[PDB]
Each structure stands twice: as C-alpha cells, then as structure tokens.
Short mmCIF file of C-alpha atoms in Angstrom, two decimals:
data_model
loop_
_atom_site.label_atom_id
_atom_site.label_comp_id
_atom_site.label_asym_id
_atom_site.label_seq_id
_atom_site.Cartn_x
_atom_site.Cartn_y
_atom_site.Cartn_z
CA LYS A 1 132.43 123.52 105.25
CA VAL A 2 135.97 124.74 104.61
CA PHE A 3 137.37 122.29 102.17
CA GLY A 4 140.92 121.60 101.84
CA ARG A 5 142.82 121.01 98.81
CA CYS A 6 143.34 117.30 99.82
CA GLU A 7 139.84 116.95 101.06
CA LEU A 8 137.60 118.10 98.12
CA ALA A 9 139.55 116.42 95.35
CA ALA A 10 139.45 113.09 97.03
CA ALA A 11 135.79 113.29 97.42
CA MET A 12 135.11 114.29 93.83
CA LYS A 13 136.95 111.26 92.77
CA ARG A 14 134.70 109.07 95.12
CA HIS A 15 131.73 111.11 94.01
CA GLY A 16 132.18 109.74 90.57
CA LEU A 17 133.41 112.91 89.14
CA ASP A 18 136.74 111.29 88.10
CA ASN A 19 137.20 111.93 84.31
CA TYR A 20 133.39 112.40 83.93
CA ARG A 21 132.53 113.50 80.37
CA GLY A 22 136.25 112.79 80.14
CA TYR A 23 137.08 115.96 82.07
CA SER A 24 140.06 115.24 84.28
CA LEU A 25 139.61 115.53 88.02
CA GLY A 26 142.07 118.50 88.20
CA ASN A 27 139.56 120.63 86.31
CA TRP A 28 136.92 119.76 88.96
CA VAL A 29 139.17 120.67 91.80
CA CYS A 30 140.14 123.89 90.05
CA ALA A 31 136.55 124.90 89.28
CA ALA A 32 135.63 124.34 92.90
CA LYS A 33 138.64 126.51 93.69
CA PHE A 34 137.65 129.13 91.14
CA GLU A 35 133.84 129.20 91.53
CA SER A 36 133.74 129.11 95.37
CA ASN A 37 137.50 129.06 96.52
CA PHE A 38 136.48 125.64 98.24
CA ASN A 39 133.41 127.06 99.97
CA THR A 40 130.29 124.88 100.08
CA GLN A 41 128.08 127.46 101.81
CA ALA A 42 129.00 130.11 99.20
CA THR A 43 126.10 131.64 97.39
CA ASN A 44 126.06 134.72 95.19
CA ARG A 45 123.53 137.03 93.56
CA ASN A 46 123.23 136.68 89.86
CA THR A 47 122.45 140.05 88.31
CA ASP A 48 119.56 138.54 86.32
CA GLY A 49 117.76 137.89 89.64
CA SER A 50 118.74 134.28 90.00
CA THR A 51 121.20 133.00 92.66
CA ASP A 52 124.46 130.91 92.71
CA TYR A 53 124.29 127.95 94.95
CA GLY A 54 126.63 125.19 95.98
CA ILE A 55 130.37 124.69 95.98
CA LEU A 56 130.10 124.31 92.29
CA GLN A 57 128.27 127.64 92.22
CA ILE A 58 125.49 125.99 90.42
CA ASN A 59 122.95 128.62 89.26
CA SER A 60 119.40 128.59 90.61
CA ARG A 61 118.09 130.28 87.48
CA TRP A 62 116.99 127.06 85.84
CA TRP A 63 118.72 124.28 87.78
CA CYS A 64 117.19 124.54 91.28
CA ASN A 65 114.26 125.93 93.45
CA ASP A 66 115.24 128.75 95.75
CA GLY A 67 111.82 130.13 96.40
CA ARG A 68 112.57 133.59 95.07
CA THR A 69 112.76 133.39 91.30
CA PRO A 70 109.84 133.58 88.91
CA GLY A 71 110.71 131.85 85.58
CA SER A 72 112.97 129.06 87.16
CA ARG A 73 113.14 125.58 85.63
CA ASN A 74 114.14 122.99 88.47
CA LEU A 75 115.49 120.09 86.16
CA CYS A 76 117.60 118.84 89.04
CA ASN A 77 114.38 118.10 91.06
CA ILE A 78 116.28 119.30 94.24
CA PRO A 79 115.96 122.45 96.44
CA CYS A 80 118.87 124.89 96.17
CA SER A 81 119.93 124.66 99.76
CA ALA A 82 120.85 121.01 99.17
CA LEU A 83 123.71 122.44 97.13
CA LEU A 84 125.13 124.16 100.21
CA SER A 85 125.37 120.89 102.29
CA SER A 86 128.71 119.37 103.76
CA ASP A 87 128.08 116.12 101.85
CA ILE A 88 129.57 116.62 98.38
CA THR A 89 127.00 114.33 96.76
CA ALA A 90 124.24 116.84 96.14
CA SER A 91 126.38 119.51 94.30
CA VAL A 92 128.40 116.95 92.36
CA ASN A 93 125.22 114.97 91.55
CA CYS A 94 123.83 118.00 89.75
CA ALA A 95 127.26 118.89 88.22
CA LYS A 96 127.19 115.58 86.21
CA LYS A 97 123.82 116.71 85.02
CA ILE A 98 125.07 120.15 84.04
CA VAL A 99 127.50 118.20 81.87
CA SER A 100 124.71 115.56 80.96
CA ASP A 101 122.92 118.07 78.49
CA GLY A 102 126.06 117.87 76.48
CA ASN A 103 126.67 121.60 76.73
CA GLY A 104 130.09 120.98 78.51
CA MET A 105 131.76 122.50 81.67
CA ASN A 106 131.25 125.74 79.78
CA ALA A 107 128.23 126.27 81.98
CA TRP A 108 130.79 127.48 84.53
CA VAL A 109 132.40 130.89 84.05
CA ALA A 110 135.59 130.18 86.03
CA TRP A 111 136.59 126.91 84.16
CA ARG A 112 135.50 128.77 81.10
CA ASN A 113 138.51 131.15 80.65
CA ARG A 114 140.27 131.05 84.00
CA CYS A 115 140.87 127.27 84.30
CA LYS A 116 141.54 126.14 80.63
CA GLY A 117 144.89 126.10 78.84
CA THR A 118 146.58 125.52 82.19
CA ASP A 119 148.41 122.51 83.86
CA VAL A 120 145.58 120.23 84.74
CA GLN A 121 147.44 117.81 87.08
CA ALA A 122 149.07 120.46 89.33
CA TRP A 123 146.07 120.60 91.78
CA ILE A 124 146.03 116.89 92.36
CA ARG A 125 149.81 116.56 92.34
CA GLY A 126 151.07 115.62 95.78
CA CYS A 127 147.72 114.55 97.18
CA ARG A 128 146.70 110.82 97.10
CA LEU A 129 143.78 109.28 95.12
#
C-alpha cells in the first residue's frame, strides 16, 4: 500500500502509537518515511542473512519468522509477512514491542541519526489528528 503523508500518520495515532514511550508521533511518521519511504510491502536483505520486513522495516533476525533464517528468535509470535499487510496494526503492534524492551527507537537505523535533532512537528503540521 502506498501511504500518504496524511494517511499513515493518522493511523499511527489511532494505532496507539501517539507519544508511545513518550516518542512524539512525528518521529513515527518520519521513521516510516525514512525506513520504507511509506512503503508497507517494502522488504530488504540484511547483510547478516536476516530480512527487513514491514513499513517499519522491522528486522526478521530475531523479531519474526520468515522461514529462511537459522538462529531467529520470534518474540513477536507473528509471521514476517504480517508486517507487510495494508492494515497498520501488525507492524505498529510489534513496533511498541521493539520499544517495550526498553532499548528505545534506537533499534531503527533511520530514526537513529537521520531523524533526531530535527523539527519533530513538521511532518504532522498541516494534516489533522
């Protein structure tokens, strides 16, 4: 699904991502913009032999089961392809969890240096929530 600016943000708010682990919604929009450029089908090869799944580019290495990786954890208790689905609830529902270890949104590479130290409200500005 090709997600708009106005479309994905609104949903992450309804998805219960709004200021989750305090992180403002504008981060969540931006990370979705930086990790997949609003693609929910987007999946990428991790060099370590794992794969990136979901709009959140959530890594299959120890989060999910993709049926190709020996040494994978599956904490999410969901198949990887459920991360690629047009309903936002499966990617978001494991993103809370990626933050629920208490290791931060620093599990994402894009929000890591590319989306910090920037205007947070500029994504959301001019769209309604």
